[PDB]
Amino acid sequence: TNLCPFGEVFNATRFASVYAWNRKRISNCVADYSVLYNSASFSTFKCYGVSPTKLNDLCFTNVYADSFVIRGDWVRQIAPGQTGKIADYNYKLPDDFTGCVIAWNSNNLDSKVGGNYNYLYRLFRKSNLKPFERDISTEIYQAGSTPCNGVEGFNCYFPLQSYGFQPTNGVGYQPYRVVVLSFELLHAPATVCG
Ligand SMILES: *[C@@H]1O[C@H](CO)[C@@H](O)[C@H](O)[C@H]1NC(C)=O
């Protein structure tokens, strides 16, 4: 009977950074996706392996929603088979993805004033993430001749960097909130339905 907790995902006070992104799991509820597709707010809402006008017919073994903030020029990396620092080192979707990516401009709800809130992404890593791997470690990264094995210095870097949004200005570099819905089809009792 109960409506699913999408309000706890889409209307939260602050969304996470793109390293250390939030994940919500959704179960034992009715998921009406019609109020998502017919909401006016969304700048992108792209679905893979399901079509949005049919989500209200389907039932899923379990549902996940992942949420974070990125610049409007990075949202193209939030798709299967993409490449770049976000897709490699911060958040990766598998090549065989069943789910939808939803994004909207948040420059009214965030970045509205002087200073900043501390949004960080990982810029350096020794190898790519696996699909849905999350990495929150902040050990020094080596980037040159000889190990530093300690303090920051010549050819060693702290792995995180700030996004550098334009100061309540610009055009493409503004903040976009993202929610990624991922749907399971494992042969067990269907915990979410339309
Ligand atoms: C977010 O809040 C608005 C305004 O209260 C509401 O219309 C919308 O349904 C909420 N989002 C979800 C996913 O329910």
Swiss-Prot record:
All residue ranges annotated as the BetaCoV S1-CTD domain in the record: 2-194
Result for mutant: residue 85 to N: In strain: Beta/B.1.351, Omicron/BA.1, Omicron/BA.2, Omicron/BA.2.12.1, Omicron/BA.2.75, Omicron/BA.4, Omicron/BA.5, Omicron/BQ.1.1, Omicron/XBB.1.5, Omicron/EG.5.1; May enhance affinity to human ACE2 receptor
Effect the entry attributes to changing residue 112 to T: In strain: Omicron/BQ.1.1
Residue ranges, annotated region (Receptor-binding domain (RBD)): 1-194
Impact reported for residue 161 to N: Reduced host ACE2-binding affinity in vitro
Effect of residue 154 to V: In strain: Omicron/BA.4, Omicron/BA.5, Omicron/BQ.1.1
UniProt superkingdom: Viruses
Protein name: Spike protein S1
Organism: Severe acute respiratory syndrome coronavirus 2 (2019-nCoV)
Boundaries of the shown chain within the full protein: 333 to 526 of 1273
